[PDB]
Design an enzyme around this catalytic site. Structure first.
Site, PDB file in Angstrom:
ATOM      1  N   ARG A   1       0.818  -1.204   0.000  1.00  0.00           N
ATOM      2  CA  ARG A   1       0.000   0.000   0.000  1.00  0.00           C
ATOM      3  C   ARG A   1       0.857   1.262   0.000  1.00  0.00           C
ATOM      4  O   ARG A   1       2.010   1.247   0.432  1.00  0.00           O
ATOM      5  CB  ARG A   1      -0.953   0.000   1.198  1.00  0.00           C
ATOM      6  CG  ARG A   1      -0.260   0.074   2.547  1.00  0.00           C
ATOM      7  CD  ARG A   1      -1.259  -0.090   3.681  1.00  0.00           C
ATOM      8  NE  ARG A   1      -0.694   0.296   4.971  1.00  0.00           N
ATOM      9  CZ  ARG A   1      -0.837   1.500   5.518  1.00  0.00           C
ATOM     10  NH1 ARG A   1      -1.528   2.441   4.887  1.00  0.00           N
ATOM     11  NH2 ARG A   1      -0.290   1.764   6.697  1.00  0.00           N
TER      12      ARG A   1
ATOM     13  N   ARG B   1      -2.481  11.181   2.145  1.00  0.00           N
ATOM     14  CA  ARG B   1      -3.309  12.036   2.987  1.00  0.00           C
ATOM     15  C   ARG B   1      -3.483  13.423   2.372  1.00  0.00           C
ATOM     16  O   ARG B   1      -2.532  14.031   1.883  1.00  0.00           O
ATOM     17  CB  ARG B   1      -2.768  12.117   4.421  1.00  0.00           C
ATOM     18  CG  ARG B   1      -1.502  12.933   4.590  1.00  0.00           C
ATOM     19  CD  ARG B   1      -1.225  13.210   6.058  1.00  0.00           C
ATOM     20  NE  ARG B   1      -0.755  12.023   6.766  1.00  0.00           N
ATOM     21  CZ  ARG B   1       0.464  11.899   7.278  1.00  0.00           C
ATOM     22  NH1 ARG B   1       1.335  12.893   7.168  1.00  0.00           N
ATOM     23  NH2 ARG B   1       0.813  10.785   7.909  1.00  0.00           N
TER      24      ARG B   1
ATOM     25  N   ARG C   1      17.860  -8.802   0.753  1.00  0.00           N
ATOM     26  CA  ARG C   1      18.533  -7.691   0.098  1.00  0.00           C
ATOM     27  C   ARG C   1      19.426  -7.043   1.146  1.00  0.00           C
ATOM     28  O   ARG C   1      19.132  -7.107   2.337  1.00  0.00           O
ATOM     29  CB  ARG C   1      17.528  -6.684  -0.462  1.00  0.00           C
ATOM     30  CG  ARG C   1      16.840  -7.151  -1.738  1.00  0.00           C
ATOM     31  CD  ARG C   1      15.894  -6.094  -2.282  1.00  0.00           C
ATOM     32  NE  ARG C   1      14.849  -5.752  -1.322  1.00  0.00           N
ATOM     33  CZ  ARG C   1      14.615  -4.523  -0.875  1.00  0.00           C
ATOM     34  NH1 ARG C   1      15.349  -3.508  -1.306  1.00  0.00           N
ATOM     35  NH2 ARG C   1      13.644  -4.310   0.001  1.00  0.00           N
TER      36      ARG C   1
ATOM     37  N   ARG D   1      19.642   6.878   0.055  1.00  0.00           N
ATOM     38  CA  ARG D   1      19.427   7.849   1.121  1.00  0.00           C
ATOM     39  C   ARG D   1      20.724   8.489   1.587  1.00  0.00           C
ATOM     40  O   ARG D   1      21.805   7.921   1.431  1.00  0.00           O
ATOM     41  CB  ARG D   1      18.786   7.184   2.341  1.00  0.00           C
ATOM     42  CG  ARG D   1      17.386   6.643   2.150  1.00  0.00           C
ATOM     43  CD  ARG D   1      16.776   6.345   3.513  1.00  0.00           C
ATOM     44  NE  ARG D   1      16.275   4.980   3.621  1.00  0.00           N
ATOM     45  CZ  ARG D   1      14.994   4.671   3.784  1.00  0.00           C
ATOM     46  NH1 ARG D   1      14.085   5.633   3.861  1.00  0.00           N
ATOM     47  NH2 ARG D   1      14.622   3.401   3.875  1.00  0.00           N
TER      48      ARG D   1
ATOM     49  N   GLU E   1      23.540   5.764   2.070  1.00  0.00           N
ATOM     50  CA  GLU E   1      23.007   4.409   2.103  1.00  0.00           C
ATOM     51  C   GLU E   1      22.940   3.815   0.703  1.00  0.00           C
ATOM     52  O   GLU E   1      22.210   4.311  -0.154  1.00  0.00           O
ATOM     53  CB  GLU E   1      21.620   4.393   2.747  1.00  0.00           C
ATOM     54  CG  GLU E   1      20.927   3.042   2.691  1.00  0.00           C
ATOM     55  CD  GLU E   1      19.518   3.089   3.252  1.00  0.00           C
ATOM     56  OE1 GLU E   1      19.350   3.545   4.401  1.00  0.00           O
ATOM     57  OE2 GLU E   1      18.581   2.675   2.540  1.00  0.00           O
TER      58      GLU E   1
ATOM     59  N   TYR F   1      10.589  -8.993   8.381  1.00  0.00           N
ATOM     60  CA  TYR F   1      10.903  -7.625   8.751  1.00  0.00           C
ATOM     61  C   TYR F   1      10.052  -7.253   9.952  1.00  0.00           C
ATOM     62  O   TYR F   1       8.830  -7.394   9.930  1.00  0.00           O
ATOM     63  CB  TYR F   1      10.656  -6.639   7.610  1.00  0.00           C
ATOM     64  CG  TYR F   1      11.073  -5.227   7.970  1.00  0.00           C
ATOM     65  CD1 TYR F   1      12.342  -4.756   7.654  1.00  0.00           C
ATOM     66  CD2 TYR F   1      10.207  -4.373   8.648  1.00  0.00           C
ATOM     67  CE1 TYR F   1      12.733  -3.471   7.991  1.00  0.00           C
ATOM     68  CE2 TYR F   1      10.590  -3.089   8.992  1.00  0.00           C
ATOM     69  CZ  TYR F   1      11.853  -2.644   8.660  1.00  0.00           C
ATOM     70  OH  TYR F   1      12.234  -1.365   8.998  1.00  0.00           O
TER      71      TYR F   1
ATOM     72  N   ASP G   1       9.328  -4.106  12.804  1.00  0.00           N
ATOM     73  CA  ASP G   1       9.553  -2.813  13.430  1.00  0.00           C
ATOM     74  C   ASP G   1      10.098  -3.100  14.821  1.00  0.00           C
ATOM     75  O   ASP G   1       9.929  -4.207  15.337  1.00  0.00           O
ATOM     76  CB  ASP G   1       8.245  -2.028  13.529  1.00  0.00           C
ATOM     77  CG  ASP G   1       7.867  -1.358  12.224  1.00  0.00           C
ATOM     78  OD1 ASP G   1       6.878  -0.592  12.215  1.00  0.00           O
ATOM     79  OD2 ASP G   1       8.563  -1.584  11.210  1.00  0.00           O
TER      80      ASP G   1
HETATM   81  C1  LIG Z   1      17.936  -0.485   7.420  1.00  0.00           C
HETATM   82  C2  LIG Z   1      16.911  -0.703   8.571  1.00  0.00           C
HETATM   83  C3  LIG Z   1      16.194   0.384   9.090  1.00  0.00           C
HETATM   84  C4  LIG Z   1      15.274   0.179  10.126  1.00  0.00           C
HETATM   85  N1  LIG Z   1      14.591   1.244  10.615  1.00  0.00           N
HETATM   86  C5  LIG Z   1      13.709   1.052  11.606  1.00  0.00           C
HETATM   87  C6  LIG Z   1      12.963   2.101  12.164  1.00  0.00           C
HETATM   88  O1  LIG Z   1      13.132   3.432  11.673  1.00  0.00           O
HETATM   89  N2  LIG Z   1      12.094   1.867  13.150  1.00  0.00           N
HETATM   90  C7  LIG Z   1      11.928   0.617  13.614  1.00  0.00           C
HETATM   91  O2  LIG Z   1      11.027   0.401  14.631  1.00  0.00           O
HETATM   92  N3  LIG Z   1      12.617  -0.417  13.119  1.00  0.00           N
HETATM   93  C8  LIG Z   1      13.503  -0.227  12.125  1.00  0.00           C
HETATM   94  N4  LIG Z   1      14.187  -1.275  11.636  1.00  0.00           N
HETATM   95  C9  LIG Z   1      13.975  -2.594  12.170  1.00  0.00           C
HETATM   96  C10 LIG Z   1      14.872  -3.093  13.219  1.00  0.00           C
HETATM   97  O3  LIG Z   1      16.190  -2.762  13.179  1.00  0.00           O
HETATM   98  C11 LIG Z   1      14.503  -4.381  13.874  1.00  0.00           C
HETATM   99  O4  LIG Z   1      13.301  -4.223  14.547  1.00  0.00           O
HETATM  100  C12 LIG Z   1      15.565  -4.926  14.843  1.00  0.00           C
HETATM  101  O5  LIG Z   1      16.830  -5.028  14.215  1.00  0.00           O
HETATM  102  C13 LIG Z   1      15.251  -6.250  15.375  1.00  0.00           C
HETATM  103  O6  LIG Z   1      16.094  -6.779  16.441  1.00  0.00           O
HETATM  104  P1  LIG Z   1      16.524  -8.252  16.368  1.00  0.00           P
HETATM  105  O7  LIG Z   1      17.240  -8.618  17.692  1.00  0.00           O
HETATM  106  O8  LIG Z   1      15.283  -9.168  16.139  1.00  0.00           O
HETATM  107  O9  LIG Z   1      17.621  -8.423  15.101  1.00  0.00           O
HETATM  108  P2  LIG Z   1      18.969  -7.876  15.174  1.00  0.00           P
HETATM  109  O10 LIG Z   1      18.860  -6.528  15.570  1.00  0.00           O
HETATM  110  O11 LIG Z   1      19.679  -8.006  13.782  1.00  0.00           O
HETATM  111  O12 LIG Z   1      19.808  -8.657  16.330  1.00  0.00           O
HETATM  112  C14 LIG Z   1      20.552  -9.823  15.976  1.00  0.00           C
HETATM  113  C15 LIG Z   1      21.912  -9.999  16.540  1.00  0.00           C
HETATM  114  O13 LIG Z   1      22.278 -11.345  16.478  1.00  0.00           O
HETATM  115  C16 LIG Z   1      23.576 -11.394  16.018  1.00  0.00           C
HETATM  116  N5  LIG Z   1      23.934 -12.625  15.280  1.00  0.00           N
HETATM  117  C17 LIG Z   1      23.476 -13.092  14.109  1.00  0.00           C
HETATM  118  N6  LIG Z   1      24.097 -14.253  13.860  1.00  0.00           N
HETATM  119  C18 LIG Z   1      24.948 -14.527  14.874  1.00  0.00           C
HETATM  120  C19 LIG Z   1      25.848 -15.574  15.165  1.00  0.00           C
HETATM  121  N7  LIG Z   1      25.994 -16.657  14.269  1.00  0.00           N
HETATM  122  N8  LIG Z   1      26.567 -15.532  16.306  1.00  0.00           N
HETATM  123  C20 LIG Z   1      26.436 -14.506  17.158  1.00  0.00           C
HETATM  124  N9  LIG Z   1      25.587 -13.489  16.913  1.00  0.00           N
HETATM  125  C21 LIG Z   1      24.838 -13.477  15.789  1.00  0.00           C
HETATM  126  C22 LIG Z   1      23.686 -10.202  15.135  1.00  0.00           C
HETATM  127  O14 LIG Z   1      25.016  -9.773  14.996  1.00  0.00           O
HETATM  128  C23 LIG Z   1      22.918  -9.233  15.786  1.00  0.00           C
HETATM  129  O15 LIG Z   1      23.709  -8.523  16.692  1.00  0.00           O
HETATM  130  C24 LIG Z   1      15.075  -1.091  10.635  1.00  0.00           C
HETATM  131  C25 LIG Z   1      15.791  -2.167  10.114  1.00  0.00           C
HETATM  132  C26 LIG Z   1      16.707  -1.965   9.080  1.00  0.00           C
HETATM  133  C27 LIG Z   1      17.475  -3.144   8.529  1.00  0.00           C
END
Ligand SMILES: Cc1cc2nc3c(=O)[nH]c(=O)nc-3n(C[C@H](O)[C@H](O)[C@H](O)COP(=O)(O)OP(=O)(O)OC[C@H]3O[C@@H](n4cnc5c(N)ncnc54)[C@H](O)[C@@H]3O)c2cc1C
Ligand SMILES: Cc1cc2c(cc1C)N(C[C@H](O)[C@H](O)[C@H](O)COP(=O)(O)OP(=O)(O)OC[C@H]1O[C@@H](n3cnc4c(N)ncnc43)[C@H](O)[C@@H]1O)c1[nH]c(=O)[nH]c(=O)c1N2
Ligand SMILES: [N+]
Ligand SMILES: [N+]
Lengths: 365, 363
Positions: free
Chosen positions: B169, B173, B246, B277, B297, B345, B347
């Site tokens: 979507r 607005r 990606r 960006r 970026e 993905y 948030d």
């Molecule tokens: C470019 C981008 C922009 C974003 N912008 C926003 C935003 O404006 N607002 C928002 O609410 N969210 C945003 N997000 C989303 C957001 O970052 C996620 O919600 C968040 O990263 C999720 O946390 P996580 O712990 O699930 O994953 P992660 O943050 O990636 O945590 C995973 C960790 O596990 C580790 N890991 C992986 N494999 C191994 C291994 N084999 N051994 C040891 N460690 C390992 C990684 O290194 C990492 O440190 C964005 C995401 C991206 C990619």
């Protein structure tokens, strides 16, 4: 990101690059060689424009094509009149009265025609091989002295071991005229071919010494559309096999004399002489220097990885090509053009026509 | 022997680590990077909290989630209002009256609506591709100026060679309002995100620079249970193949001026400009210093092993994920969570909700 990624800076790629950039499109040209121009590339050596990949004489019966190329250059009045050396004998090409008077010691068109026809007629059944085919076309004398040894070098085997399909026609003219091409428009670009490509590629980004295939995904992502003028089978990883070609090897020599052979092109038709031709490049532009560059043209046994010069185009290779072409038809925004992209021998005028037709259909706003 | 081995110190891993340690469980956290925080990690560079892995703006409509994060920090009142630059032109995001007045030289909501709804109608069938999908939603002009080139760079091909499913979507607005998010709760944590993870992991043993899968033997029976927030397919040695992503590459630059672009986020929506960006980090916390850190970026080609930013989530990859999900349901004492463990993905708010819900059932 570019509008177009063009693989190859030969005649097809450069014409498209020129036409596209003239209409405001951005083009990235990726070339594996250290220079542009493809097989039409000329290198200035000792003030002589050397046809590095073989003699390239432009000719056409199409005034539009002639006028198109004249945007990038001026053509001289070079007339191709090759000489054929057979052992201790020397003859004029193409097959004309100059050839026939020398061969048989005759003088009139009727004398020559009588001999040609009587010799052709010794073949009273459909040719079973290339030898019988050539003989059926021009008779034994012309075949043995001007065709046999030359052909056996090009193909690496006896004409009796070759299919009749390799030679379809062998034109004969009963006029004293050494003009090899019958076309109304013929010549050599003054200043060489490479300067034409400089003009065509001026508004493009050109990257040299880069094999697109070694960076396939990287480069595909850099443009919305791709025009590939390399080998279509190579693009698809030779997955069905390599389309068969014949190859050549050129040995370029700088000689300390003003005039080596007195003509641009000399065919050597004796099998025992390893080269098929010797090219004296200065004669293409009527050069007046005290040194000369010649190129000995050698047949080179082809296999995948060796420079593809002449496509075979037999039944099995056409079937193979159509398999690759079917892959191409279903890969959107990737287009194959040129001698290598379409697995066919293109004269320069033919690829100009082919490129411009592609431009007309592809380029809009 | 620890109670829990937590692979990854991102949002999911750190929240569970906090909750577990608070309830008196021993937690070992193994992180492959030089630092904690995962993709939310901020690094203090020239007194500016730099969002190292992309702009991260917290937002939610759930007061509970918002209140939970407030335990570890105080949020400012940052409002995300990205700017879009297309060739020589400049526009406001998201798609609002500021955008429409600039695009078409009109002034009233109805003038804009007339144009958009007229332009949308050139698509009469189900969209055959991404181009038709975008046009069917916002019309040709908005698509060409603000979506087309931006998307082409992200995917490396034309939008008519992309599936319509990529864009679900495109909200429009008819109000003069550049607020990118409609959430009642939004902002940036004062002092950065890393300070939040510092607090969460305080009662846990943290091991950095250690890829768990690379040294799985060194962590044999060192804990009773394992919470894996890494790639689920990688955990199972890519038995069924690699889940497609990606990727992105950031070029961080330090400039000797106080204000480079006058806004935190600028989108470059023409395909000619290589980066998608430029992020000026100091604007996230209303910086006042005399230098600035920006980040270009770039979309980065992803192959197996490359940093996983955005999951593809197409049919092929969902079928692939489901295979791995089935394996996980039979894997005793091992749990998968987070964006990487679940191939989705998320948030930041989604992860908080997801992490806490797992904490509810496990702790
Ligand atoms: C470019 C981008 C922009 C974003 N912008 C926003 C935003 O404006 N607002 C928002 O609410 N969210 C945003 N997000 C989303 C957001 O970052 C996620 O919600 C968040 O990263 C999720 O946390 P996580 O712990 O699930 O994953 P992660 O943050 O990636 O945590 C995973 C960790 O596990 C580790 N890991 C992986 N494999 C191994 C291994 N084999 N051994 C040891 N460690 C390992 C990684 O290194 C990492 O440190 C964005 C995401 C991206 C990619
Ligand atoms: C021996 C010989 C002699 C002549 C001729 C052919 C041959 C074989 N020709 C024909 C002429 O050479 C031909 O028309 C052109 O080469 C065709 O132009 P292209 O762009 O089709 O291909 P061409 O082969 O020129 O150009 C292709 C380009 O693509 C590049 N390429 C291939 N793969 C690549 C990759 N993976 N990555 C990056 N780059 C890659 C190549 O390096 C090359 O530069 C001729 N015609 C005529 O009218 N009169 C004449 O006298 C002659 N003489
Ligand atoms: N498109
Ligand atoms: N663009």
């Amino acid at each position: 990101m570019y509008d177009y990624l063009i693989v190859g800076s030969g005649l097809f790629g450069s014409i498209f690059a020129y036409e596209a950039t003239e209409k405001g499109y951005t083009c990235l040209v990726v070339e594996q060689r250290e220079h542009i121009g493809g097989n039409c590339y000329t290198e200035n050596i000792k003030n002589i424009n050397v046809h590095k990949y073989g003699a390239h004489i432009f000719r056409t019966s199409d005034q539009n094509i002639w006028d198109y190329m004249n945007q990038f250059c001026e053509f001289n009045h070079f007339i191709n009149s090759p000489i054929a050396i057979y052992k201790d004998e020397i003859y004029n090409l193409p097959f004309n009265m100059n050839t026939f008077s020398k061969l048989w010691g005759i003088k009139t068109p009727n004398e020559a025609r009588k001999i040609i026809e009587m010799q052709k007629q010794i073949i009273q059944h459909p040719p079973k091989n290339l030898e019988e085919q050539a003989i059926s076309l021009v008779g034994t004398d012309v075949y043995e002295k001007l065709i046999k040894g030359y052909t056996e070098k090009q193909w690496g085997r006896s004409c009796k071991d070759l299919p009749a399909s390799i030679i379809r026609r062998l034109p004969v003219r009963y006029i004293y005229d050494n003009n090899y091409f019958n076309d109304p428009y013929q010549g050599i670009p003054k200043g060489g071919y490479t300067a034409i490509f400089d003009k065509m590629l001026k508004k493009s980004k050109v990257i040299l010494n880069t094999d697109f295939l070694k960076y396939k995904d990287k480069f595909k992502n850099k443009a919305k559309k791709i025009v590939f003028t390399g080998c279509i089978d190579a693009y698809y990883d030779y997955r069905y096999g390599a389309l068969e070609y014949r190859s050549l090897k050129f040995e370029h020599k700088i000689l300390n004399l003003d005039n080596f052979q007195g003509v641009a092109v000399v065919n050597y038709t004796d099998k025992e002489i390893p080269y098929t031709r010797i090219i004296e490049h200065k004669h293409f532009e009527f050069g007046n220097t005290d040194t000369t560059v010649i190129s000995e043209e050698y047949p080179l046994e082809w296999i995948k990885g060796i420079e593809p010069y002449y496509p075979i185009n037999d039944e099995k290779n056409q079937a193979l090509y159509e398999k690759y072409k079917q892959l191409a038809k279903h890969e959107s925004n990737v287009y194959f053009g040129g001698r290598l992209g379409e697995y066919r021998y293109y004269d320069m005028q033919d690829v100009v026509r082919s490129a411009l037709l592609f431009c007309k259909n592809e380029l809009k706003n």
